[PDB]
Structures are given as structure tokens and as C-alpha cells.
Amino acid sequence: DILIVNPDDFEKGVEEVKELKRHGAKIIAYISKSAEELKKAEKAGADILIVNPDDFEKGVEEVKELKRHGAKIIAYISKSAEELKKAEKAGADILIVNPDDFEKGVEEVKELKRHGAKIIAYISKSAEELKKAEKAGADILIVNPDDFEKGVEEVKELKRHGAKIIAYISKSAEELKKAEKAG
Structure with a gap:
């Protein structure tokens, strides 16, 4: 459902976004540490602007x-529920848990769910981990694979399971086109 460009550089990122826009991709997202870079992604056809901050002070300013x-739609990536609560304050629409540890990740999700956070997302390589994040209150299940053929099967499994919203992270519009095909 949501195709997330993980760019090598400005120029290459924009080329992937443009190719997804050309393909007729429905919801395109772009990851950067920089508001200035994200503004050039929104122009090329990104609907979701994902801040991936160096540190939390710097992240909230972006x-x-x-x-x-x-x-239109701002997302923020963090390991911590506490950082994401404050990210929401500054106007992050989507709070993305990128955990060090599965056990810790799910507790971050439960904590955000208690606080009544707007939109919760969870990044994992594993459909099984994402099923459990969903149970704990994640709305958006983000597949971040170790390899392509493996990534696309995890998407097909989350589709069978019935996910509200599936996202996929790739450097490659080619990979993202097949992930969209998969759900």
C-alpha cells in the first residue's frame, strides 16, 4: 500500500520517486534526516515525508x-515511545517504531497505544513480528527486508493475515513495484 524510498543520495532518491510516480504508484514515501531534502521529494511525487533524525533535538526541528x-503527511522514525510522543507534538502524523529488540519494540507500541498516539507504525524484516506489533496496536506494518524475494513473501503473508496498511522499504523502484503487486 505505501512504497518507501530509502535513498542512496538526493539524485538517485528523486529518480526512484519519479519512476514510482510514472508507474502510477498510489502512496510514495521518502526517508531523510533533512526537511530541505524532503521538500524536493514531495515535489517529485512523495505523499509521506519520513524524518529519520541524527538525534532527537535535531529531528524535532526538521x-x-x-x-x-x-x-501533507509527516512521519518520524525512533526507537523510543517518549521521542515519538514529542515528535507528534511538533506535528508528526505517523509515529514509526524502529526497535533494537523485538521484545522492546512491542512495549514501545503498547506505550504509544496507551498514550493514544495518532498513527503507529512498526518496522521489521518478519511478517510474524509485524503480526504481534499489529496485535499491540500498530496500524502500519512496514516490511524492511534482508533480501527482495524474501521481502515480497512477507508482504504476501501480511496480505493473507489482513493488515490495515502494509508498507515496504527499498532503494529500488523496481522492488517497490513488485511489493505493491504483492499488497
Whole structure:
């Protein structure tokens, strides 16, 4: 459902976004540490702007800069529920848990669910881990694979399971086109 470009550089990232826009991709996302870079992604056809911050102080300023800019949909990646609560404040629409540890990740999800966070997302290589994140209150299940053929099967399994919203992270529009085909 959501195709997430993980760019090598500005130029290559924009080329993938443009190719997904050309393909007729429905919901395109782009990951960067920088509001300025994200603004050039939104132009090329990205619907979701994902802040992946160096540190939390720096991350929240990029969210306030995209909020001032009038970005349609802002997402924030963090290991911590506490950082994501404050990311939401500055106007992050989607709070993305990128955990060190499965056990810890799911507790981050439960904590956000208690606080009544707007939209919760969870990144994992594993459909089985994402099923459990969903149980704990994740709305968006993000497949971040170790390899392509393996990634696309995890998408097909989350489709069979019945996920609200499936996302996939790739460097490659070619990979993202097949992930969309898979659900």
C-alpha cells in the first residue's frame, strides 16, 4: 500500500520517486534526516515525508520546518515511545517504531497505544513480528527486508493475515513495484 524510498543520495532518491510516480504508484514515501531534502521529494511525487533524525533535538526541528512548509503527511522514525510522543507534538502524523529488540519494540507500541498516539507504525524484516506489533496496536506494518524475494513473501503473508496498511522499504523502484503487486 505505501512504497518507501530509502535513498542512496538526493539524485538517485528523486529518480526512484519519479519512476514510482510514472508507474502510477498510489502512496510514495521518502526517508531523510533533512526537511530541505524532503521538500524536493514531495515535489517529485512523495505523499509521506519520513524524518529519520541524527538525534532527537535535531529531528524535532526538521518536523517543525516541514509543519511550517505545509507538508501533507509527516512521519518520524525512533526507537523510543517518549521521542515519538514529542515528535507528534511538533506535528508528526505517523509515529514509526524502529526497535533494537523485538521484545522492546512491542512495549514501545503498547506505550504509544496507551498514550493514544495518532498513527503507529512498526518496522521489521518478519511478517510474524509485524503480526504481534499489529496485535499491540500498530496500524502500519512496514516490511524492511534482508533480501527482495524474501521481502515480497512477507508482504504476501501480511496480505493473507489482513493488515490495515502494509508498507515496504527499498532503494529500488523496481522492488517497490513488485511489493505493491504483492499488497
